[PDB]
From a paper:
What is the EM structure of MscS in DDM and what is its micelle placement? We believe the pore and hook lipids were carried over from the cell membrane during purification and reconstitution, as we find evidence of similarly placed density in our DDM MscS map.
In prokaryotes, MscL and MscS are the foundational members of two structurally distinct classes of MS channels. Sensitive to tension changes in the plane of the bilayer, they play a key role in the response to osmotic challenges and remain a de facto standard in the search for the molecular principles underlying membrane force transduction. The E. coli MscS crystal structure in detergent revealed a homoheptamer with three TM segments (TM1, TM2 and TM3a/b) and a large cytoplasmic C-terminal domain cradling a water-filled internal cavity.
Author numbering:
A (entry chain F), B (entry chain G), C (entry chain A), D (entry chain E), E (entry chain B), F (entry chain D), ...: 15 to 280
């Protein structure tokens, strides 16, 4: 006759049981509700059936799983084990997604800081080109050849960034080879006359015409000038052509590879 | 005579015991149920006996293990230790699977974004070819030679992506070598006449015919043109052939490697 | 006379003590039981005394350790510390085994997906050969030379996979060098006649006979054809031999390395 | 008639319920409050709508989520599971942001220590230039050519740092080649006379004029001097020119590549 | 006069105190016991005073530390902090030992699988030799030169494994160069006669005598044969010698590097 | 009329509330106190406004946050969630700082062990120079050229360390080339006479004068000697000069690159 | 008048308060005690003021921090937050120290196993030399040149280890070039006579004198012999010298680089 005497014990367990069932059913209707709601809000963005609908299904499963674990705890069964396995799974998936998340974070930083603007000619680790646009997970640029390149944001931020366009003026360099016999002063004079004649070069800024080094086959002269970024490339070509003409007119000779032979007959 | 006086203590322990046994048996029938259910739902997809049936067995073991740990906790024995070892195991397996999970996540991102479409000619880190299809864990493409290549999705997203097809028009480049003696202006005139004659080249877009650099053995001329992607390759060959013919007709001579010897007898 | 008055306190502690001893002894008999059971089931697979028997001993130790920790908790001594050290150890061993586990997981994926079948000629990062079989932790293939190679599954999945056999048809390429003096049209005609004569080449598919590039010592011709994978290698050799014969018959001359010397005496 | 008898139980549950609702509503008004406050304080710094407003929204969501979880715990539902999933997410995002955080920490260290000052000529792993400024996440410097380079702080601290400017004086080195026939002592005398004549060289500091090594084609002389950093470059050029002139005046001859032929006729 | 009225409170705290002291002393005697026991069992294996005795001391310290922490918890002082620091330390040491543990695990796998047997000629990433024995943490092999090499097990499993011995038969390859003038058919006939004469070659298996490629200086012939692994090396040498003799007898001439000069006087 | 009957319940909640408010206010005054104290102690070391004052502000925020979380727990709201997010943040920041902490730890080890002393000539992975000083996070050394280099402590400890200065005596090596025609014994005799004449060489220690190898163009002789570290460099130069003189006196001839031509006219 | 009625509540809180203060003060005296004790025991080993005294200070701070946290818990304030931040810090520092700990563990393994003894000539990844001693964190060896090298233990264990000394006997190899015209048999006979004459070579062990390969400029002969490790180097030199003499006596001629020219005049 312990039953009549333990009515209170029965009350305690019965309220817990009905509360657990109530939790199950309320969580079920809550899950239905949340599932329809998430779709209602998800349709706004572009939506792919094979993936986007799938992820809403994932959410449904996650909610019912949480409510179920909670219910099992309500019943009075230790859920620490299921919590542990769940946490291991979550950690693993987070590790897997770390890579993509890094690209996302980089992209955000690059967007707010703006190291390079759109439409600028830059290089991002050996790939010169003009940027077209920036995106969340990736960057898009066009090469000189015309090929399109896509590069992940996370990869570029780590590497060095070079922005030719940001600087208005840039410097040029020429190297020239001539024979040993030829006079130094004559060549220097000619080169000075040439560079002086040009107009797209900045007089105020430095100009260098000296003998940098002595090659084995021939001596080498170095020339340095400064010009606007836009006209740089044209300047190079024009100067080079003028040099070729002027040297042949002057009498200087360009050097071929040089060989000296000691020559005996056996 | 403590027994009669501690009837309530006995009640407390007895209810816990029978509840633990009930948990064991209900978990057993639940595990049988879940095992048959998972197979019922698993048969839909392609199923390999050596692996797929094995994983259902794994699920059976996992469920019975969870229920068993819970039962041990119900008995009143500290289960924190078994929880700890279980969590270590789960973490380890998650780390092991991280690699494959990364490929999966990448594939998802690539699918939704579509950096490159199927049937496009692209390169994905030094392997040019045409894509055939995209998959969950991997990508499939065909090389020009005809070899098939498979590349994991996770590997390509990290690296740069190049999409030749995405751009309609592309640029070409030629390099040419000629002797120093030969006149600059004559060569330039000839090359201009050639490129002008062609019809598959875009007049509106830039055209470059200049002396880029001075080689040691010979001077070098650079030529740049723009044409449609489809006809690019043909254009290259036709232009090259026409150049060879035109130069020999003109009298210009192509250069062989050049050597100059100072020559003494011992 | 607190003892008589605190009989209940004594009861509480005494039941805990005897329950702890009971747990110890039941865990001992359980451990004996489990140890014999694991051997009974382990004998089925191949079993090495120096390792396999050792791991059963490990299991014995693990079970007795768990039961002992639980008993210490039953006595009323904080076991959180022993749990912590145990968890650190488990994490460390899991990290150590991560590498091998990765190979295992890869192997599973490769088995179910079947990127390459057994008996196919494939390359798996610079090692061409024919696969012999697939295994759990590793893959086995034979090289052309006849050497056997073993490669871990985890390593290959990361790298690119190339399956020559999967594709029925493949393409070939030849490169040829000839003197500048020689006529273009004559050579082209001869090469076309040759390739046309062959029967193992696919007429429907493309055929290319053009001047690809101008070498310094000599010009270069490129030839491309398509043929079945099986007969490809033979086709290459036969074509090459026929070419050698046909050129000497025609009067064309193959080029040696070319040198031009300006020659003065001192 | 358990209700009348369990008034106290009802009181207990009712106070918990109303307290949970109170927590929900107070947390709601708190969240509104915090959201407006964070904007009020955020406007001070530069603010981008697409990102900065977004992060305030994130904060709103985070606060309401915390309060909601707390409320669920107040109701009496186990929240350990939701805590676990939340912690996994937090760990993952922290891992993702680790990279950028590293750059930030580096930048801080570099700022306080000041290995290199602004406006100094330094190299930071193969990129010589002058620093312009230091920033939080990145560093900015200008190359000699005039190109701008941006380099992340985290990358440079790991690598070696070279500060030319920090040292007032620096050393120079010349290498010279001459024929075997030429006398050693004469050359040494000439070189000593040259270096002695210069004035921008530090007499007190060492000066080296010796035969370092015997090349195959010719012998090699090494020269070392010390000069101020500013005038170093000029000194090099002037010395080199003077050397060329002095040698031709002296009668020494510079060497061309040397070849010796044993010469037989077949 | 609260003392007389709170006798029970005093009892509660006093029993806890004496139990804590009892735990301390029992743990002390337990630690002495365990320390002597571990030595008793440790002497069996080889034992180094500077390290092995040290590790027994470590065990003593660990046990007393655990018992001490437990005692502090018994007193009623929160030990969660000491647990936390202890767990951090354990995690760190586990990370440090991960490397060695990996080698151990690899060694186990290699032992049970036996990719390569002892006394076999194998290469394990560019180090050819004969294995001598396998060990727990490392592998031992001898090179052809006679040098001894030790390689850690963990390093080799990651890399490719090549087992020459496992395969009974292997293939050989020869490359040969001859002048352009020389007849193709004559050379082919001679080579066929040679290989046919040999007896250590497998007739049933393939034999290849064809013109593989056209070198610039000379044409190249390829020869392939199959022979037993043991006699392979000898076969190579004998064949090569016979070839040299046969060619000079036949009248064919081996080629020297070939140069062609266009030769003008200035 | 439950209020009058539940006075005790009201007491319980009221004491908790006032205690929570007391905790808030005491923590506030404690935070003010700690903030002023930390500055008082921080001024001793060099202090940067933009960073050092900022970190004191950080401490203020941290303390108020801890006290606030504690207060929320006092109120009776589950704080496990806020604890979880806080722990994730702490883990992330610790990971970020791991890099710098590694440099710090290395520096400590290097300081106490002293592998290389200050003012010694050492190389630390391809950067030879003299150390100037050691610091906490980095090391400073000067190169021979005079450039200053800074290298992080963590990077050098991993790599090999070479200490020229630690060893008093060092060895030298010379290589010499001579013509085939020249007698072996004569050359050996001459070289022995030379090295014997020198005084800065250690007679007791080994001396080697032998023919090491046969070059294609010429034979090579190797010479090895031992001398004090300080005088090593001078010894090299003096020996080399003496050798040049002695050979020309003896009649031996140094070799130029050697070519042999078979020479036919077409 | 709740105070008089709640005397017991007051007792409960008052005992907790005084116990907390007692814990604070006992922990303070305990910390003083431990601080002096640790110094007393620390003086035995070499002790640096800037670091070693600092670490004792660290210990003082750690103990007072633990006792303080415990006290805060005794007061009744949730300390889980402070525990969490502390654990994050500990994890971070452990990660930082992981590197050095790895070197320590390696060193231990190497010490007990003894792969290489002290005073042996070994190479440890491209650095040949003689070991001098082994240490805890690092290894010390001397190079042949006389330079001292220090290498961390953790780095070497990962890489291959080569122990020349462990093996008593070693093998040698010579390569020789001769003209095509020269007879094979004569050369073989001469070489056999030479090697047979020597006495420091092991007759029982193999001896190889064969034509290994056909070079373009000349044919190549390979010779292999076995000798004791100590006398190996001397044997090489003596054999080489004898070979040079014997060939010139025999009439064989060593080959120079060979060139063949087809020679036409334009």
């Amino acid at each position: 006759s312990w039953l009549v005497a333990n009515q209170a014990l029965l009350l305690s367990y019965a309220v817990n049981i009905v509360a657990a069932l109530a939790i199950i059913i309320v969580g079920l209707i809550i899950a239905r509700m949340i599932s329809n709601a998430v779709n209602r809000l998800m349709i706004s963005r572009k939506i792919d059936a094979t993936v986007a609908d799938f992820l809403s299904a994932l959410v449904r499963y996650g909610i019912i799983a949480f409510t179920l674990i909670a219910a099992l705890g309500r019943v009075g069964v230790q859920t620490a084990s299921v919590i542990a396995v769940l946490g291991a799974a979550g950690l693993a998936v987070g590790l897997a997604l770390q890579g993509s998340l890094s690209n996302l974070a980089a992209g955000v930083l690059l967007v707010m800081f703006r190291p390079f603007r759109a439409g600028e000619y830059v290089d991002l680790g050996g790939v010169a080109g003009t940027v077209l646009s920036v995106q969340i997970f990736s960057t898009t640029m066009r090469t000189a050849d015309g090929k399109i390149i896509v590069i992940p944001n996370g990869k570029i931020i780590a590497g060095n960034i070079i922005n030719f366009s940001r600087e208005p003026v840039r410097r040029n360099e020429f190297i020239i080879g001539v024979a040993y016999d030829s006079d130094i002063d004559q060549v220097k004079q000619i080169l000075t006359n040439i560079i002086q004649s040009e107009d797209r070069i900045l007089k105020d800024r430095e100009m260098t015409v000296r003998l940098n080094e002595l090659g084995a086959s021939s001596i080498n002269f170095v020339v340095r000038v400064w010009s606007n970024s836009g006209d740089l490339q044209n300047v190079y070509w024009d100067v080079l052509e003028r040099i070729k003409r002027e040297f042949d007119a002057a009498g200087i000779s360009f050097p071929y590879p040089q060989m000296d032979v000691n020559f005996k007959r056996v």
